[PDB]
């Protein structure tokens, strides 16, 4: 509790297409606090559910990369909204996808923000959000 | 008309299973009023979010087909759990996918149930759930 707790979410069983980007995000988040996340660099379901729920409640900020569709990321964002968490979502329009209306439409520009970004930009945008 | 039955399934995550969603929605109509975005373009997404949240809050039972990964379906299920809704999830293992741990691990066998099924079983299973 001596540093901010930053909870990172991104697709796993939805697909690990963006795993490298997730590691880039996590690595940068470590500059701004303790990172709580299921994601581990390449280098039971009830327990997985309960641990991520535990991390989520501990979180001061929830950071989600929402480009790859994922039930778990969506579920974690829904639980996070119900917990009144500050939320930042990061989405890549160049993927060719249209972001879920439930995520884009949940944005209010303050406590729930959805930022579009392109390859090469995410570290700069994280610096902006966390006030480097 | 009650019960109100809220159906969720992938849309912008992919419409791979849209025909199965229609089969599910058609069978749900036998047991209650069906509230769903599904019917057989961003820029106004706030209105979509608010409308599905409205339907979810009115729902007596939430039915989700969770085979195709979807942020919206997952988000709706997360909000549904926070609302302490009765939830039924339906998953097809023959899809070759491993269902999200956040959905499978949310199950408690009563208020939150996850049923595996195969093509051709979904109507019988819905009949069974809704008595
Ligand atoms: C909670 C942590 C992680 O971000 C998310 C992964 O969900 P999947 O359904 O496995 O993609 O769950
Ligand atoms: C709310 C209703 C529907 O089941 C779900 C679809 O989400 P997508 O992110 O568009 O797949 O959203």
Residue numbers in the entry:
A (entry chain A): 18 to 60, 72 to 160
B (entry chain B): 19 to 58, 69 to 159
Question: What text appears in the publication on this structure?
Answer:
The cellular role of DNPH1 is to remove hydroxymethyl deoxyuridine monophosphate (hmdUMP) from the nucleotide pool. Hydrolysis generates deoxyribose monophosphate (dRP) and hydroxymethyl uracil (hmU) products. Glycosidic bond cleavage is driven by a conserved catalytic triad and proceeds via a two-step mechanism involving formation and subsequent disruption of a covalent glycosyl-enzyme intermediate. Each DNPH1 monomer adopts a Rossmann-like fold consisting of five core β-strands surrounded by five major α-helices.
To visualise the trapping of the glycosyl-enzyme intermediate, we employed a crystallisation construct harbouring a single E55Q point mutation. Purified DNPH1E55Q protein was co-crystallised with hmdUMP and the structure solved in space group P212121 at 1.65 Å resolution using the DNPH1E104Q structure for molecular replacement. In the crystal structure a biologically active homodimer comprises the asymmetric unit, and both active sites contain a trapped glycosyl-enzyme intermediate with deoxyribose monophosphate (dRP) covalently fused to E104. However, in both chains, the dRP:E104 moiety adopts two distinct, alternative conformations, one of which permits an additional interaction between the constituent sugar and surrounding sidechains. The base of the substrate has been cleaved and is no longer visible, but has been largely replaced by a well-defined water network. This network is stabilised in part by E55Q, which is now presented into the active site through reorganisation of the helical element harbouring the LTEHV motif. Consequently, H56 tucks away below the anomeric carbon. Remarkably, E55Q appears to be ideally positioned although, due to the mutation, chemically unable to activate one of the bound waters for nucleophilic attack at the anomeric carbon, in agreement with activity assays. Crucially, the conserved catalytic aspartate (D80) is too far away to perform this activation, and the active site arrangement indicates that this is also the case in the wild-type enzyme. In this dominant arrangement, H56 electrostatically drives the dRP 3′ hydroxyl group to form a hydrogen bond with the remaining sidechain carbonyl oxygen of E104.
